[PDB]
Short mmCIF file of C-alpha atoms and ligand atoms in Angstrom, two decimals:
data_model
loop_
_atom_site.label_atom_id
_atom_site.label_comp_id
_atom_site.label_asym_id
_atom_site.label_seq_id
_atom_site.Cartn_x
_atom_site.Cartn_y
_atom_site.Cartn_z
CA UNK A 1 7.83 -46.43 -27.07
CA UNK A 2 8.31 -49.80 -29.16
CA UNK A 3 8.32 -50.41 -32.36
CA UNK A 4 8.44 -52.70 -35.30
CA UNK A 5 12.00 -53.15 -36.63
CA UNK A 6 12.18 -53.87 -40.32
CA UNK A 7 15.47 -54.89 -41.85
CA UNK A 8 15.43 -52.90 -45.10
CA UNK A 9 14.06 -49.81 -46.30
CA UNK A 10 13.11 -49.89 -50.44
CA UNK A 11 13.45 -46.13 -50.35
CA UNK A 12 12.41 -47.31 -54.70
CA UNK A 13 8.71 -47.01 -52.92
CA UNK A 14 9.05 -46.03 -49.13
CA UNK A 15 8.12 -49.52 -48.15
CA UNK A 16 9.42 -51.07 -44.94
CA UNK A 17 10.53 -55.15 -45.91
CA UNK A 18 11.79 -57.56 -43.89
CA UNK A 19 10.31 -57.41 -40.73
CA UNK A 20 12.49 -58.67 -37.86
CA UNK A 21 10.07 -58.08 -35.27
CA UNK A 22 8.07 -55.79 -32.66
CA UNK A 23 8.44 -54.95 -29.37
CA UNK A 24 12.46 -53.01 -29.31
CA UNK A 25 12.99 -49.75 -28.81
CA UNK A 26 13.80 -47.61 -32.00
CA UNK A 27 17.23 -47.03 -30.29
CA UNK A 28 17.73 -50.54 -30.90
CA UNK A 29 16.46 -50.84 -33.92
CA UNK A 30 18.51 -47.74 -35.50
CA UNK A 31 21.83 -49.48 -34.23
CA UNK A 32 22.12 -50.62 -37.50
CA UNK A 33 21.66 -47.20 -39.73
CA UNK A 34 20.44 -49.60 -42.82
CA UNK A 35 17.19 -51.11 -40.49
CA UNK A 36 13.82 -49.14 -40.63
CA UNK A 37 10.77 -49.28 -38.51
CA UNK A 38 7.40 -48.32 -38.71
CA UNK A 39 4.36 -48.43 -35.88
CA UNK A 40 1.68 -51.43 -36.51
CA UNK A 41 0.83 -51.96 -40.53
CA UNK A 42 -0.74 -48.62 -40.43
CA UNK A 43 2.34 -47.07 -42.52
CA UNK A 44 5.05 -44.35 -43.31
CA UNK A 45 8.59 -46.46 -42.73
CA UNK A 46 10.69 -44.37 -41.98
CA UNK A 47 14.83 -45.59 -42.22
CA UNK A 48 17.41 -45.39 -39.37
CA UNK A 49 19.37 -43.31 -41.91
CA UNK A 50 20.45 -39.45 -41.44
CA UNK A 51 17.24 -37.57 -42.35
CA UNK A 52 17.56 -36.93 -46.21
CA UNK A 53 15.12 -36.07 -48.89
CA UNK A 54 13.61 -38.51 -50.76
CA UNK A 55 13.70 -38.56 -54.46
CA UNK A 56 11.00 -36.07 -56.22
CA UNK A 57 7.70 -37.84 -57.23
CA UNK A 58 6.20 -37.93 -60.53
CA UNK A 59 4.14 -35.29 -61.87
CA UNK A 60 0.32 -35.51 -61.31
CA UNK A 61 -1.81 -35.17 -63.86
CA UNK A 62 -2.48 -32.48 -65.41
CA UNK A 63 -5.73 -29.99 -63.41
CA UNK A 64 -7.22 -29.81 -66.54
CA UNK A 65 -7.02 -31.66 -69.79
CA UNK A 66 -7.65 -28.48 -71.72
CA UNK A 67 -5.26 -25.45 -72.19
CA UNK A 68 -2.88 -24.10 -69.55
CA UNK A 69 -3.22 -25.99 -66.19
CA UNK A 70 -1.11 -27.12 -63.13
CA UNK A 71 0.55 -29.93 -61.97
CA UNK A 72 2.27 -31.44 -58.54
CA UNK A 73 4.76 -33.56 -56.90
CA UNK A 74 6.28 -33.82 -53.83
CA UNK A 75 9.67 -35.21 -51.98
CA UNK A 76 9.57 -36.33 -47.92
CA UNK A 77 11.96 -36.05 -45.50
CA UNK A 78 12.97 -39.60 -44.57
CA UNK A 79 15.00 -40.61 -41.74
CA UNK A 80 15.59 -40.57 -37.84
CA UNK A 81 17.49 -38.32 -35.39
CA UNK A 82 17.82 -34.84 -37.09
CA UNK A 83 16.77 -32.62 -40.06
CA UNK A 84 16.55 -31.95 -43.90
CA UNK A 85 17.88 -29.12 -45.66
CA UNK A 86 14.93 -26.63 -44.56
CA UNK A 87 14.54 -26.62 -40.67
CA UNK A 88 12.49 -29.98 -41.92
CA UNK A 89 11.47 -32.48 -39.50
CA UNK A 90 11.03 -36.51 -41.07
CA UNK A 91 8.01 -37.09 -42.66
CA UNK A 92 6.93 -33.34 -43.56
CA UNK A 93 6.42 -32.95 -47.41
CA UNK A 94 7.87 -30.45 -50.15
CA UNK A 95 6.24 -29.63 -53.09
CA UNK A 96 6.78 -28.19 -56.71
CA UNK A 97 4.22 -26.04 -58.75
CA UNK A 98 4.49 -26.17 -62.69
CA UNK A 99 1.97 -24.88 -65.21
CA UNK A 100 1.22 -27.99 -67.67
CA UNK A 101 -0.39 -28.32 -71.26
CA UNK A 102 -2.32 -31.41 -71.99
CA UNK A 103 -3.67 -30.12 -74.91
CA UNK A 104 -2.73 -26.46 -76.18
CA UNK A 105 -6.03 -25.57 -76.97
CA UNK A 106 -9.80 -26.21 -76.06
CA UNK A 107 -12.54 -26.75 -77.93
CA UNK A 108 -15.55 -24.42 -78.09
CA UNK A 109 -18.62 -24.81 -79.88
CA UNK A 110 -20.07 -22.15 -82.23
CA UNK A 111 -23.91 -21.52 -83.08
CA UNK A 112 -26.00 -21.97 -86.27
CA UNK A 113 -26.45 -19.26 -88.71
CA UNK A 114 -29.94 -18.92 -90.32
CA UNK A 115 -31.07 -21.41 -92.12
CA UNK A 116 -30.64 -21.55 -96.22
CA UNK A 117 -33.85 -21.03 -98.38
CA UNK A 118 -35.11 -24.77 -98.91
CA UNK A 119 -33.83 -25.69 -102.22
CA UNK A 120 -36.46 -27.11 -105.21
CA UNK A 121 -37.18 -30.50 -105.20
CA UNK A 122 -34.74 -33.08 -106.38
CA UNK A 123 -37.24 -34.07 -109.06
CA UNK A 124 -39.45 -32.45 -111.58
CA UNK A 125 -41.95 -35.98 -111.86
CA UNK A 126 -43.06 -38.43 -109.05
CA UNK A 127 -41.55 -37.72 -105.96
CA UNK A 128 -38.26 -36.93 -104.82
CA UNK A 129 -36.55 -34.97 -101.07
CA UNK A 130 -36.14 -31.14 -100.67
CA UNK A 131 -33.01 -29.74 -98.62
CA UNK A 132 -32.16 -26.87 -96.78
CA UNK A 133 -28.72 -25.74 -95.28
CA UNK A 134 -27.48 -23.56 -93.48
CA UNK A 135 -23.57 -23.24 -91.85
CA UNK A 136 -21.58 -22.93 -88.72
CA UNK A 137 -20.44 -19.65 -88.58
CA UNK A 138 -22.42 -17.61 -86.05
CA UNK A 139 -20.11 -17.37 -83.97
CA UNK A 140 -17.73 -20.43 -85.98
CA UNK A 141 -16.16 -22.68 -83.01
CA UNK A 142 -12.84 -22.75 -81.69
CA UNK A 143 -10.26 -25.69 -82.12
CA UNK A 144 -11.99 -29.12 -82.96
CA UNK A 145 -15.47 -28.19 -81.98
CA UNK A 146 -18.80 -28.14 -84.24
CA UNK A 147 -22.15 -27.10 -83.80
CA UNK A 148 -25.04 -28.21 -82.30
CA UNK A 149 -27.30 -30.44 -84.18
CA UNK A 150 -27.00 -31.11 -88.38
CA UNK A 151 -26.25 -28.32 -90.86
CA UNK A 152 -28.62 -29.56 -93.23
CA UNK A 153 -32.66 -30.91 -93.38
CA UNK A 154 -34.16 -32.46 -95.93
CA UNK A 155 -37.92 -34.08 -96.29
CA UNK A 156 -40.06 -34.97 -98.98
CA UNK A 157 -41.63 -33.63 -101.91
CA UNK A 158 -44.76 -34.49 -104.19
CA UNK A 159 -44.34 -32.76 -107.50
CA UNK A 160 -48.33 -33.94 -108.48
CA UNK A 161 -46.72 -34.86 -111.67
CA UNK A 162 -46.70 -38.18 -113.67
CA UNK A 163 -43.01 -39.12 -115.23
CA UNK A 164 -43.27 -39.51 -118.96
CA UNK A 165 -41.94 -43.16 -120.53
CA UNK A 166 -39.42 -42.63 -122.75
CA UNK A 167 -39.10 -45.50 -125.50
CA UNK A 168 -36.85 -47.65 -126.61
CA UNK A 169 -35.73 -49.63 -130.06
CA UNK A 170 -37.02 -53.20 -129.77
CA UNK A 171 -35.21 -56.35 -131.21
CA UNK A 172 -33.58 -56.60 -134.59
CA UNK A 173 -36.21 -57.82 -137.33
CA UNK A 174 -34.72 -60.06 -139.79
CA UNK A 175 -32.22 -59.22 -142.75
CA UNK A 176 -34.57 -59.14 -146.13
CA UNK A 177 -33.29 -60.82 -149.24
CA UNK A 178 -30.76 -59.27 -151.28
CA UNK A 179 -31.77 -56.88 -154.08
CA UNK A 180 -29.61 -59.25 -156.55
CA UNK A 181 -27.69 -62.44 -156.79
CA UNK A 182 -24.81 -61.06 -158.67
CA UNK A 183 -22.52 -57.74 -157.90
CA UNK A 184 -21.81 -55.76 -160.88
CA UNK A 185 -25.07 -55.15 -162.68
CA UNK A 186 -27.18 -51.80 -162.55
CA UNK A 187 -28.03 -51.89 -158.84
CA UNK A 188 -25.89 -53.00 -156.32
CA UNK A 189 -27.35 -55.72 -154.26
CA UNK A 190 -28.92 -54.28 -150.74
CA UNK A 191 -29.67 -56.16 -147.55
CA UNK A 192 -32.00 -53.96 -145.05
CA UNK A 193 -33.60 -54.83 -141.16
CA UNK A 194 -36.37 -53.17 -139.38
CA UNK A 195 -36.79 -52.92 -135.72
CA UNK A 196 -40.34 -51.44 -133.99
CA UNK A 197 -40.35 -48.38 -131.54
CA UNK A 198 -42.68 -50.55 -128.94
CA UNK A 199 -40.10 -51.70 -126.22
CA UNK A 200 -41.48 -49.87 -124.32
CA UNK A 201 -43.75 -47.28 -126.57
CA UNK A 202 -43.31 -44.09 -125.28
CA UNK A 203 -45.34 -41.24 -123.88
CA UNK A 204 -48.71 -43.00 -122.65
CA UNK A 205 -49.87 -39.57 -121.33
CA UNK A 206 -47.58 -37.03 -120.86
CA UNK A 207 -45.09 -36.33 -123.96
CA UNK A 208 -42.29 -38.99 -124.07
CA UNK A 209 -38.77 -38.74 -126.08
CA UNK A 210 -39.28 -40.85 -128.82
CA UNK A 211 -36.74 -43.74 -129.85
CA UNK A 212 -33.00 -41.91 -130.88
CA UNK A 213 -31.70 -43.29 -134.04
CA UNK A 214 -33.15 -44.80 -137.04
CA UNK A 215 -35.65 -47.82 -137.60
CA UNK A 216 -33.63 -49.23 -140.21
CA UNK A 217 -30.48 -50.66 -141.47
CA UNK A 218 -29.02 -50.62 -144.61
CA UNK A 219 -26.22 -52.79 -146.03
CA UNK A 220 -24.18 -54.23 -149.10
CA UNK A 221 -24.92 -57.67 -149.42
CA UNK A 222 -21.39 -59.58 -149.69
CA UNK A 223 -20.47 -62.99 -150.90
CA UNK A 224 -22.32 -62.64 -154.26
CA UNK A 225 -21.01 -64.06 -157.28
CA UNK A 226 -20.07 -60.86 -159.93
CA UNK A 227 -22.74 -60.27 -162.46
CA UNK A 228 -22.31 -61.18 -166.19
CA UNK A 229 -21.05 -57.89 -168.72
CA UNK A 230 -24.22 -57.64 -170.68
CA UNK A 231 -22.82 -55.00 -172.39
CA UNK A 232 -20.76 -56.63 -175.64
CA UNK A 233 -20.02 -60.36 -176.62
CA UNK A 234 -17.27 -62.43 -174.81
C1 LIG B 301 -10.39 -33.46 -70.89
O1 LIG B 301 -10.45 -33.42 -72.29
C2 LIG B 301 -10.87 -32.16 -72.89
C3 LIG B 301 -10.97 -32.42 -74.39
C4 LIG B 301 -12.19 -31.61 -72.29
O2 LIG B 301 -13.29 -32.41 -72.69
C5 LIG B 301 -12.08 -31.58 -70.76
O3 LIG B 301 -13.35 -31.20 -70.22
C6 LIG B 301 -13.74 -29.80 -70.27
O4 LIG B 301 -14.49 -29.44 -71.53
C7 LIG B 301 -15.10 -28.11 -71.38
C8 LIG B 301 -15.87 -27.75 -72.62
O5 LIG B 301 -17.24 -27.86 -72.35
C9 LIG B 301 -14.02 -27.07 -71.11
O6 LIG B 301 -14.62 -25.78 -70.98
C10 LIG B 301 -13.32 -27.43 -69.83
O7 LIG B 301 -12.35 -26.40 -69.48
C11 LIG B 301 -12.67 -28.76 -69.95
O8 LIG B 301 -12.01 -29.10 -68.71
C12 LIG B 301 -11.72 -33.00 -70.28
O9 LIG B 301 -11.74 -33.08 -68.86
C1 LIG B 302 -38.49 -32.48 -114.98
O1 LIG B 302 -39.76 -32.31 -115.56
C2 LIG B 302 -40.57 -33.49 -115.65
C3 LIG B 302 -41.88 -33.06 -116.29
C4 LIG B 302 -39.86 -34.62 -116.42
O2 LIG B 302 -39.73 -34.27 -117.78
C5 LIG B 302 -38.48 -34.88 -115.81
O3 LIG B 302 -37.77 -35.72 -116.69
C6 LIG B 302 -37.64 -37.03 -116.11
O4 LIG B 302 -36.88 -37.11 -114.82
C7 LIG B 302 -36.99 -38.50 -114.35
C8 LIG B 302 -36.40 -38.69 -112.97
O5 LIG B 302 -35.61 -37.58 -112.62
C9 LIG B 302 -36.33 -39.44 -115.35
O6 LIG B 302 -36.39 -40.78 -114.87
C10 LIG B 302 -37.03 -39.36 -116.67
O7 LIG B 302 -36.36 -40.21 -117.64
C11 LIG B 302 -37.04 -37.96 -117.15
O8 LIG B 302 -37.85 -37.87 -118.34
C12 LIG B 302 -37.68 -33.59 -115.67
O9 LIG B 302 -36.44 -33.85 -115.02
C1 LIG B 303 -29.34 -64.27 -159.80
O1 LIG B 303 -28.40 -65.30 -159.81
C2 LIG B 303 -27.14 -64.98 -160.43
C3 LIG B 303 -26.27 -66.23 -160.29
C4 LIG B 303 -27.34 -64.53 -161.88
O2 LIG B 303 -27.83 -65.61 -162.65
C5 LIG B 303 -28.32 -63.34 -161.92
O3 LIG B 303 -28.60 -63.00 -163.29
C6 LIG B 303 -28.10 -61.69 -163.63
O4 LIG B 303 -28.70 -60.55 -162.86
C7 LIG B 303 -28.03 -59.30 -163.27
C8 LIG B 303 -28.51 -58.12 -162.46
O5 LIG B 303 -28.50 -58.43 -161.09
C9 LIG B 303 -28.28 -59.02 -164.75
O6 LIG B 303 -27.59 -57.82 -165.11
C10 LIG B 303 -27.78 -60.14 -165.60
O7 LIG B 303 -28.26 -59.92 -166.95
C11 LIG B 303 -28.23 -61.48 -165.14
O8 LIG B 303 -27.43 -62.48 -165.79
C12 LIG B 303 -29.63 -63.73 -161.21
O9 LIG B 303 -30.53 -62.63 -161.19
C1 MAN B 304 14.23 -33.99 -57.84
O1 MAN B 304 14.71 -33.00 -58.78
C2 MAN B 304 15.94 -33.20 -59.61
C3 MAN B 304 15.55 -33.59 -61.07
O2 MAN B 304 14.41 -34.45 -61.11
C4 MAN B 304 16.98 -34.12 -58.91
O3 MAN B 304 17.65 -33.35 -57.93
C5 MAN B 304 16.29 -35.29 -58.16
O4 MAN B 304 15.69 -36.23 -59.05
C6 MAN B 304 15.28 -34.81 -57.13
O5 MAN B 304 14.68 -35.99 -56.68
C1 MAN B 305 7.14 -34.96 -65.02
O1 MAN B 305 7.96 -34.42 -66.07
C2 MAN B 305 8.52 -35.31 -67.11
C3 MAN B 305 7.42 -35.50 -68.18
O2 MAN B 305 6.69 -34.28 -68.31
C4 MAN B 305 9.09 -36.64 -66.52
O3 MAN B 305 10.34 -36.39 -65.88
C5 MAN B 305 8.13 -37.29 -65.48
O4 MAN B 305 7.06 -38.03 -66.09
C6 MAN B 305 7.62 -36.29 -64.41
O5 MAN B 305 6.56 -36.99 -63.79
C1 MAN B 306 -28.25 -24.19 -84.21
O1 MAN B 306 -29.45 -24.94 -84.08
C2 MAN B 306 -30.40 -24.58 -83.03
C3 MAN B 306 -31.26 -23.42 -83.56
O2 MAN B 306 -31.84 -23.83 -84.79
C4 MAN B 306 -29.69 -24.31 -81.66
O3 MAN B 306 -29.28 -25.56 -81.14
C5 MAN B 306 -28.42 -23.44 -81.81
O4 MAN B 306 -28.72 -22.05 -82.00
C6 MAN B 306 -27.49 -23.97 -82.89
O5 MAN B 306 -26.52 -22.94 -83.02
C1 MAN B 307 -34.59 -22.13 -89.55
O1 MAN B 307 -35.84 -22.73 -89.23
C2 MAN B 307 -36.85 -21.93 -88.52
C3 MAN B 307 -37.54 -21.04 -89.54
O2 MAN B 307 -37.80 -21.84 -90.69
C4 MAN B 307 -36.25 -21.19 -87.29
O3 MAN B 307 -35.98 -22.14 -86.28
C5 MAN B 307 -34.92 -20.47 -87.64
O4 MAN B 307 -35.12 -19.21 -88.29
C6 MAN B 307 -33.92 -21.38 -88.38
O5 MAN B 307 -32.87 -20.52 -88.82
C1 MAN B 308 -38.90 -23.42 -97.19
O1 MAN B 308 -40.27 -23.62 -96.86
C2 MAN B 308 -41.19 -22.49 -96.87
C3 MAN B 308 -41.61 -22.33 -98.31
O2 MAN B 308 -42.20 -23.57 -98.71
C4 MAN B 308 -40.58 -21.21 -96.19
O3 MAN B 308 -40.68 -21.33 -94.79
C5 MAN B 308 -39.07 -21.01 -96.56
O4 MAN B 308 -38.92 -20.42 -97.85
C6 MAN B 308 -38.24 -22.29 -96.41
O5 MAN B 308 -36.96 -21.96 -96.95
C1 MAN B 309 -32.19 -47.88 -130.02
O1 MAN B 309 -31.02 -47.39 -130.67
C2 MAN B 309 -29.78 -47.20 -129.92
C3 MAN B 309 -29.07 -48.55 -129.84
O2 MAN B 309 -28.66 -48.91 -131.16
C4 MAN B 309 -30.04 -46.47 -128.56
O3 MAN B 309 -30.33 -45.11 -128.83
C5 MAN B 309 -31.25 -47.07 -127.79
O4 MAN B 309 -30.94 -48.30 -127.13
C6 MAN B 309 -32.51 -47.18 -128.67
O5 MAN B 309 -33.46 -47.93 -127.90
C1 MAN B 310 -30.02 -55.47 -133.41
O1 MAN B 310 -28.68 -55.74 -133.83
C2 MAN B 310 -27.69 -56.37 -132.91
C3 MAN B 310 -27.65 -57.91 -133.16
O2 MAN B 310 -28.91 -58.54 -132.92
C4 MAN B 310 -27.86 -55.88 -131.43
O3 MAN B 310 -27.37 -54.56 -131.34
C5 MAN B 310 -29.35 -55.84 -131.00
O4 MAN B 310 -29.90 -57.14 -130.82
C6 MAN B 310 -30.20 -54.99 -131.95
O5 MAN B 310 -31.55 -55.21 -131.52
C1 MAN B 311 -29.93 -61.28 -140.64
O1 MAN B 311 -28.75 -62.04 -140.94
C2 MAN B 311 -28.64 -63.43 -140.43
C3 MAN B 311 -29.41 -64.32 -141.41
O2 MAN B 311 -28.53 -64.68 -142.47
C4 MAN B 311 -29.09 -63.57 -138.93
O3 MAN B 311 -28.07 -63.07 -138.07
C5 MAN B 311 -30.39 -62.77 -138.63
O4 MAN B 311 -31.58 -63.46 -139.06
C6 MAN B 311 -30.33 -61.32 -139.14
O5 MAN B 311 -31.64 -60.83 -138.95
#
């Protein structure tokens, strides 16, 4: 039966190249032990070589990309005129088994334990969000894997209650005039400023903290010229 003679076999990828024509006998062809033929574009080029196993594929990918699995890859019988090692004919197919491990270890999800008494609200005045939690530990998953859904709620909560204003000093009044013009006498001389508790006043309805500190400043008053000794004659 004819044939198309090719004038190299890649054997790299089982392709047949270099076509030198159809219509020979694969007698012919195989003459030359380094030709290869194949029948119509349909495939499997097969060389004029001694049958001889090819090289062994790559492995396949893995069955499962989760724990132990199980991968393939095969080796064919290429040639013309005679057998592999194995009673094989050319073109039959030998394969090798091997247990694989994309990942060592799979993921399962655990379950929700009951959920957490809902805490107070985040707020004693106005309004504010109340929580409730609850964990993953009924049954607690395996390897990277989490529960379904959020471990925690939260919503709103209207305490019914009015925030106090707490007050706050106002501005600086301005420095008085010094108690004396002169430092020395009976008194020393004093400088004192006043500030107001009305920015903002506090309270308003419910009790407020009223303004930390004092209202007032006192100082010595510097830069005076000393007072006269009024006390015997120079
Ligand atoms: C490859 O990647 C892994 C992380 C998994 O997602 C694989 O899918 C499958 O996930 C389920 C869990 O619901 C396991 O029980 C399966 O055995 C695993 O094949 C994915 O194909
Ligand atoms: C809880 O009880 C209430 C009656 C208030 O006294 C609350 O104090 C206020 O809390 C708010 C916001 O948390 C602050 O802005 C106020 O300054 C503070 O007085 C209290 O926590
Ligand atoms: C204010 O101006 C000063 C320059 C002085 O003339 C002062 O007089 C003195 O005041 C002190 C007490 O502060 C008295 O003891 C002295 O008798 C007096 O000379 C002034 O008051
Ligand atoms: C497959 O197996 C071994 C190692 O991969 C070698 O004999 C040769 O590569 C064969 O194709
Ligand atoms: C399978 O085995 C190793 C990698 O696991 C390599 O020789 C090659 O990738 C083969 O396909
Ligand atoms: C926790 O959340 C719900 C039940 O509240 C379910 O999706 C499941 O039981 C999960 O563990
Ligand atoms: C928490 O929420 C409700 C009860 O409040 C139920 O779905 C279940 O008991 C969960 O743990
Ligand atoms: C919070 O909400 C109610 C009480 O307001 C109850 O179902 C339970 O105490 C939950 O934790
Ligand atoms: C006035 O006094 C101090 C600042 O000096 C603080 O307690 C606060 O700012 C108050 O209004
Ligand atoms: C009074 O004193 C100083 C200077 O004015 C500042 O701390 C602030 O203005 C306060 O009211
Ligand atoms: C008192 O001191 C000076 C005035 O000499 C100014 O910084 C300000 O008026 C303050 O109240």
């Amino acid at each position: 039966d004819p044939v198309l003679c090719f004038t190299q076999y890649e054997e790299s990828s089982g392709k047949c190249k270099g076509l030198l024509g159809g219509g020979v006998s694969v007698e012919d062809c195989c003459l030359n032990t380094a030709f290869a033929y194949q029948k119509r574009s349909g495939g499997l080029c097969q060389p004029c070589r001694s049958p001889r196993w090819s090289l062994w594929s790559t492995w396949a990918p893995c069955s499962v990309t989760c724990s132990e699995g199980s991968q393939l890859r095969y080796r064919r019988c290429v040639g013309w005129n005679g057998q592999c090692s194995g009673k094989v004919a050319p073109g039959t197919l030998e394969w090798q088994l091997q247990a694989c491990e994309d990942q060592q270890c799979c993921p399962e999800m655990g379950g929700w334990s009951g959920w957490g008494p809902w805490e107070p609200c985040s707020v004693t005045c106005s309004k504010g969000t109340r929580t409730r939690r609850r964990a993953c530990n009924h049954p607690a998953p395996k390897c990277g894997g989490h529960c379904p859904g959020q471990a925690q709620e939260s919503e709103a909560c209207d305490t019914q209650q009015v925030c106090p204003t707490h007050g706050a000093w106002a501005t600086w009044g301005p420095w008085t005039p010094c108690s004396a013009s002169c430092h020395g006498g009976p008194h020393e001389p004093k400088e004192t400023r006043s500030r107001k508790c009305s920015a903002p006043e506090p309270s308003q309805k419910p009790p407020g903290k009223p303004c930390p500190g004092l209202a007032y400043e006192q100082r010595r008053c510097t830069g005076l010229p000393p007072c006269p000794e009024n006390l015997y004659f120079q």
